[PDB]
Amino acid sequence: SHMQTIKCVVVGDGAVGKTCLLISYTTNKFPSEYVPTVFDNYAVTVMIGGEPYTLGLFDTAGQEDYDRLRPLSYPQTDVFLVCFSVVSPSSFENVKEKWVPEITHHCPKTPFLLVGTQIDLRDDPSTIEKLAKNKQKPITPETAEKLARDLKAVKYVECSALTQKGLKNVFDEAILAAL
Amino acid sequence: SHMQTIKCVVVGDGAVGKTCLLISYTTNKFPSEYVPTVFDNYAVTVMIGGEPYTLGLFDTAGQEDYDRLRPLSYPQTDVFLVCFSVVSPSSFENVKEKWVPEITHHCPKTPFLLVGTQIDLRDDPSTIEKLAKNKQKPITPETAEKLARDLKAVKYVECSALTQKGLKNVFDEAILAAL
Amino acid sequence: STPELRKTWLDSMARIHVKNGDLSEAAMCYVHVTALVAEYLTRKGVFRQGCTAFRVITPNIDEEAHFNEDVLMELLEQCADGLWKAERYELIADIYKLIIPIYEKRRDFERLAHLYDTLHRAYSKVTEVMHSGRRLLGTYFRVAFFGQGFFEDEDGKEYIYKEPKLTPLSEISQRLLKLYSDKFGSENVKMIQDSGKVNPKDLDSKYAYIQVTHVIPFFDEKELQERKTEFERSHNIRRFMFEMPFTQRQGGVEEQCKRRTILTAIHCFPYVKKRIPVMYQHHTDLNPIEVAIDEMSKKVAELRQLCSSAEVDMIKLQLKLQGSVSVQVNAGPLAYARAFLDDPDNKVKLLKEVFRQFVEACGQALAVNERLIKEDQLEYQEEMKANYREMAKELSEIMHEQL
Amino acid sequence: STPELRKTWLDSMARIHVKNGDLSEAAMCYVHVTALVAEYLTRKGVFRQGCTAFRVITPNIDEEAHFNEDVLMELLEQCADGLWKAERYELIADIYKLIIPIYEKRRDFERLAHLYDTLHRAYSKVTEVMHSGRRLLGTYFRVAFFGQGFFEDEDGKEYIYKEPKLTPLSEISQRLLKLYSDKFGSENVKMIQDSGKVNPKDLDSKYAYIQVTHVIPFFDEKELQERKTEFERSHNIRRFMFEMPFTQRQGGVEEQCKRRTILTAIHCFPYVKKRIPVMYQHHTDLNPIEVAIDEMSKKVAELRQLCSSAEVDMIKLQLKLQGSVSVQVNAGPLAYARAFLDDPDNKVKLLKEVFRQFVEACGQALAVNERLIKEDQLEYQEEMKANYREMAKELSEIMHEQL
Numbered sequence A, B: 001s002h003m004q005t006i007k008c009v010v011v012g013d014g015a016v017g018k019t020c021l022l023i024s025y026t027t028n029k030f031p032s033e034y035v036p037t038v039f040d041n042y043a044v045t046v047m048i049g050g051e052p053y054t055l056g057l058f059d060t061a062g063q064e065d066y067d068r069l070r071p072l073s074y075p076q077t078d079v080f081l082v083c084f085s086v087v088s089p090s091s092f093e094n095v096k097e098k099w100v101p102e103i104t105h106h107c108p109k110t111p112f113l114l115v116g117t118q119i120d121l122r123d124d125p126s127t128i129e130k131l132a133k134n135k136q137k138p139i140t141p142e143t144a145e146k147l148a149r150d151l152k153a154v155k156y157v158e159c160s161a162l163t164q165k166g167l168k169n170v171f172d173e174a175i176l177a178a179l
Numbered sequence C, D: 001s002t003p004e005l006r007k008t009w010l011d012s013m014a015r016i017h018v019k020n021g022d023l024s025e026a027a028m029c030y031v032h033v034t035a036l037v038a039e040y041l042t043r044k045g046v047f048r049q050g051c052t053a054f055r056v057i058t059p060n061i062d063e064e065a066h067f068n069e070d071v072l073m074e075l076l077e078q079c080a081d082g083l084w085k086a087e088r089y090e091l092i093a094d095i096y097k098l099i100i101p102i103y104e105k106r107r108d109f110e111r112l113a114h115l116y117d118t119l120h121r122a123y124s125k126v127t128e129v130m131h132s133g134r135r136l137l138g139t140y141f142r143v144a145f146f147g148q149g150f151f152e153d154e155d156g157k158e159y160i161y162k163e164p165k166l167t168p169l170s171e172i173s174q175r176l177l178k179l180y181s182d183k184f185g186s187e188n189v190k191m192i193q194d195s196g197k198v199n200p201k202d203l204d205s206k207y208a209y210i211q212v213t214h215v216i217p218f219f220d221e222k223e224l225q226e227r228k229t230e231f232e233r234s235h236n237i238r239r240f241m242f243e244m245p246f247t248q249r250q251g252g253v254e255e256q257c258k259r260r261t262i263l264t265a266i267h268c269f270p271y272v273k274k275r276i277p278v279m280y281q282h283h284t285d286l287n288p289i290e291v292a293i294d295e296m297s298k299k300v301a302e303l304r305q306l307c308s309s310a311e312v313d314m315i316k317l318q319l320k321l322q323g324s325v326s327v328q329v330n331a332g333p334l335a336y337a338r339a340f341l342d343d344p345d346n347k348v349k350l351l352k353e354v355f356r357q358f359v360e361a362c363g364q365a366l367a368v369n370e371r372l373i374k375e376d377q378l379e380y381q382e383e384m385k386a387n388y389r390e391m392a393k394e395l396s397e398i399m400h401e402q403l
């Protein structure tokens, strides 16, 4: 038997760190030393209990100017990664308002996960201060657990591309849910 | 699986050519060049449709002085070779009178064959003349067929140790019947 | 005896590796022990080879510059089984060839049956995994330690680390934290996430620094020709490579340079240890256009290999093709043409050629995909097909030719 | 080319042998063809061996004193499969060793898998048949033709004939009648059933005479030590033996002599033909006591081998033992003792020793059999046990010692 190829699709607001985590995990690089690429999308082989899987990572533009074309890549998806920044409250809001609704439509039974990003920013003075000045705290794990089950995600996971904590787990669970 | 060892027992009147055929077949020699042996009994490997069989040939004394001990070797027999000379009419008579009765007793279900020997003597002036002078002809095949089925032998076979015609067939059928 | 000491050392190193699950390093220990016994026995006229029939299995054998035939025989069977467990099947015959004549002389047919059973299975596994890609021989990393205060003699030293299966950068990183935090206290360990040659001339002498860079096996054109299989490119490897973005860090295409660093370890992998000091290194810088050219080349070959296949992968084909023509997030291969293929350097005979081969590739890609879509896409293939043609015009436009 | 002619000849000889079912002779044809191609290719620097790596498979190769690697490879696979069909398993590795490095260089893992599958099976068969005795490699016969009138150039010539499986004297005999009667008319063919060196000085010049004598492979003490297995005693055999009774034909023990004739063929079996001219012969005469000694020896070893076994054969043990102590029809081992061990030649230290070993053998035989009888015999074992002891007294009596 030849290796199985799990189509995974990443969706979430622009600037939540979508492309950053994809490139980071798949090139085995820290953000700071990406050799820039003109091409989109990413392929990575992951080891899930004995077996090698080739994970196909489809990167989507999160802006409205692309609302119409984005879903063209939604047919065939085996699992969805819905991203939001744990330090961008609007990010979180789009999850419930725009994102999981957008996908649940086309791929009704397709499983998705709740991915929260940039969690290393939780320990950042500048960012924290920015939040306070609008009367806000970064999304916390548990609150994100809630959203998850409510909206019926397989589960919720979080990571930092920058410190690469949680990074492996994210794409693991991604493969588990797609299976 | 190790090779199977078919115990075969030879019985018939003295001087019918019992020992001669046994030694002849088993040593691959013509009668005239037997290296004489002080020992009895013979072992030979025969090829019966693909398989090698080790045939165990038990030689019996045919005289009355041995009536009491002869049957000691009758337990365990898988087949019997009852010999008579096709040029010795008395030989033939003992088959029905002494021989097949002697064996049928101890080994009731054990199969036996009717073996007629010295068939090359059928083409001998001296022997033929000897027969005529007592008003006799050598036993012919068919007449020996009769005896065979009557006495319920598996079949009848004949050979000459001297010209070795029929020799192979005899021990073949012997193995077939024992099986 | 030193051969007996060396042995002892290798045999315990082996039980440790076995415990840790580092089977190839265990196997190498068996081979080194076996090569030692063979060399000695060869000098005594009991065996006919020694060290050098083992040099094919590993060049590191050169480092090994009571015992009898029966011991040798038992060690050889040990190496064979070692290599089976390491999944280095291709290498088992090299060992058994040494023991076959001994078994023949002893008329040991049962042993011969067994060894040839193993070789049959081994060569059977080989075709399997050459096709199923399920043999995962390891990932490699440049690791460097900084901080005399906590590392001492280890300060400044760079190693290649060989890690299990598909060990990600993210995973070995953590593991070295948890390792050196549990040894030098939590808040005392810092990680350098930058691949540049670093000077201690700006490190806080208070902390232990660890630098971890992912690297891959490197080969020149001659080596790529001697090593035709993936296995040959994963065995006896001494040189590793990584590329680093720089500007004269990460900029726009017009200015994007790349540094390729080749690291040479003092011994090859696999070895009796899972980390090996770097012996030597050097680098090669690439211009933004060289970069472009190189980047473009890798994509067309990427597509071709996908197209020209029997066991074609629809998902992995769309992924590569969509990211080729239906580019949403990143710049787009056109950025190379706009910034480089307008109206310099006559080596552009390369940059253009590749763009010629690029369109031909997406076309064949579209073509192939045309025949895979379960209709539910179909429209999706049209946009792609539409984008292909669209950009095809753009390139043709700037290059003043067809597409 | 002569190599091309020789080839042609060997390849058709092979199809004939295949048709006749004489597989080992076909195999030898493949090897000779293969050795020819190898030798030639070795001279051209394309192959590294030639003739002599094949000399181990057959010494007859020495007789061979368009073509390319790929042909060689196909012939080698042909020899291997040839040898498998001949059931000469032990020999297959000798061929494959020649093609293994070629497959390795070509990275042909599928081929390597197959060849090692064959070797595993082969060595598997070997232990089987070494135990099951179901491999039947052939029976051998001295055949001689007399009668210039019908045989011509064949008159006087002696061959060793190699016959299938267990072909009995009786069967090859007939077959040569039916063969030469259908060629020289029925009543014109006569068979000489006597093993003595015959002089035409008393043959009816009117008839074609055929003399057929069963012979077995012969080896001296050195050869019996180089050839430990039955297979080694059935492969590459050049000398054959038969024994003939004579008197200074068959007499009483006091006078029974024996002539042992050793025949040497011009080539060894197996060969590209199933009959081979006798090159040379000689003989050795044995006295009646030497005869006795020799005959006695064979029986005790016969019994011991039966006794000292795991897969003990009750029938074949009784048969040999009954014919040892419960002798009804023939003379009886005592005849040797009475005619030789009374009160000459001091070599009797042999004749006695054997009689010492003889009783010890029957005893162990009785002993063993005591533990096999399903009671239905039991009495039978008693008479035997009774006869053993009885004669035991007789021997003790004449030898003036215990038993």
Ligand SMILES: Nc1nc2c(ncn2[C@@H]2O[C@H](COP(=O)(O)OP(=O)(O)O)[C@@H](O)[C@H]2O)c(=O)[nH]1
Pocket: A012, A013, A014, A015, A016, A017, A018, A019, A020, A021, A031, A062, A117, A118, A119, A120, A121, A159, A160, A161, A162, A163, C329
């Ligand atoms: N500190 C920090 N910054 C991040 C992380 N992930 C992404 N970023 C930054 O977020 C910005 C936008 O991220 P991007 O890759 O474009 O995400 P996208 O717009 O959703 O595709 C970039 O400047 C990144 O460097 C993270 O884990 N930590």
Ligand SMILES: Nc1nc2c(ncn2[C@@H]2O[C@H](COP(=O)(O)OP(=O)(O)O)[C@@H](O)[C@H]2O)c(=O)[nH]1
Pocket: B012, B013, B014, B015, B016, B017, B018, B019, B020, B021, B031, B062, B117, B118, B119, B120, B121, B159, B160, B161, B162, B163, D329
């Ligand atoms: N012409 C001829 N004589 C035979 C044949 N078989 C046996 N004889 C002779 O018959 C005589 C007695 O045979 P023997 O072996 O003692 O048979 P047994 O007494 O039944 O054991 C011997 O002289 C043999 O040579 C045969 O097939 N043809």
